Design a protein around this ligand. Structure first.
Ligand SMILES: COC(=O)c1ccnc(N)c1
Ligand SMILES: COC(=O)c1ccnc(N)c1
Lengths: 216, 215
């Protein structure tokens, strides 16, 4: 069993984790996902979680005090603290495999212009911390990234179940005048394997030449 | 100004995103996000959306006849059809900027084994189609990728979500000392040219450490 805790100021945005495979993994008892409202750990009546950045700049930074209290309660020395951020190390398939064997993930979701760096620095004195980016784009908050990470990891957990995959087809064999590639209907496993390997390598050079060690 | 239609067998997955739209943007008619259950376009009593792959192999492939009907109803010639797939072209910040001025996005959410390729190929003969990946990992379905794409795009449309090279370096706020860690004194110095130079060096170091590909 894995435990995943997600900490966020928008707990309602994490509801989709109840759908499809994360939902089915939860129902199978393979994982427990708990979502926590960061404002639970505030003490002012304003429940303030942010303030202006030292040194200037646009926007607001999440305060370390509130985060520290939340993580103190939720984390242990065995926790893997995951902090989604566009400035993170890349989260990849390899990362997903690695984290799939973890006992406890805590995902700290930032909003505004990010979380005071001392939160991660303080946590790293007690536990393993991983600041990660899920791709080359910016979001308003870490919540959607948390959903991506949870899905990519949970589908790899024992008991739940390079190159680009080429096109796939199913019935009927002809549709709107478009035919399924005849080799796929031929029953020749060697020819199908070869055609699929070729399609995979062809799609990869077109869409992801970087995966084969080429420019762009 | 932008309409987004999402087609999925898990429509509830997209509902917090709809709720997260500020009323002011909806009232101003800046944005409309509609979610459609793909099973609306199934043909049989069992509401079948997938079938075994031609050529053999594991998993299931989503049916072209079902998807074809769904897109026929939902798309027009002006539609940008977005198909999240781990086998796609990379979705990047540049892509998000490009798509932020579109009138109509339709996002087709499929299982990772894929939608029958004839669906995208047929659609591409009468509209613009973009098969895209949001990163180097596999999900079970495209729904979480759809959420990422919707958020990355809509936050670039003025007034829609409520928000106003090298990696950004660390940020700090009050208090100036916390658990034995002080905010870097340069940030309190009132020397704003020096602060900018310090931030540039922090950005350089962080980029070398975390994303050497960017240099
Ligand atoms: C606020 O979080 C983000 O913007 C984010 C998080 C993780 N990966 C990204 N590419 C963006
Ligand atoms: C099923 O969809 C995916 O697995 C997917 C979609 C978009 N980008 C990815 N990296 C994966």
């Amino acid at each position: 069993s894995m435990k995943i805790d997600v900490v966020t100021i928008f707990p309602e945005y994490l509801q989709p984790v109840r759908q499809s495979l994360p939902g089915k993994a939860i129902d199978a008892g393979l994982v427990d996902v708990a979502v926590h409202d960061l404002r639970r750990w505030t003490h002012d009546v304003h429940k303030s979680v942010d303030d202006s950045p030292y040194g200037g700049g646009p926007g607001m930074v999440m305060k370390p005090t509130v985060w520290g209290d939340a993580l103190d309660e939720i984390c242990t020395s065995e926790t893997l603290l995951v902090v989604p951020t566009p400035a993170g190390y890349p989260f990849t398939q390899e990362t997903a495999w690695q984290w799939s064997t973890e006992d406890h993930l805590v995902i700290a979701c930032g909003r505004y212009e990010g979380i005071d760096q001392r939160v991660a620095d303080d946590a790293a004195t007690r536990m393993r911390v991983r600041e990660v980016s899920i791709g080359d784009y910016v979001l308003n908050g870490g919540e959607a990234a948390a959903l991506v990470i949870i899905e990519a990891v949970l589908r790899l957990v024992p008991g739940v179940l390079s190159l680009l995959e080429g096109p796939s087809y199913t019935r009927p064999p002809s549709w709107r005048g478009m035919d399924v590639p005849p080799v796929l209907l031929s029953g020749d496993h060697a020819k199908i394997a070869a055609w699929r390997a070729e399609q995979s390598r062809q799609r990869t050079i077109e869409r992801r030449p970087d995966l084969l060690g080429f420019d762009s």
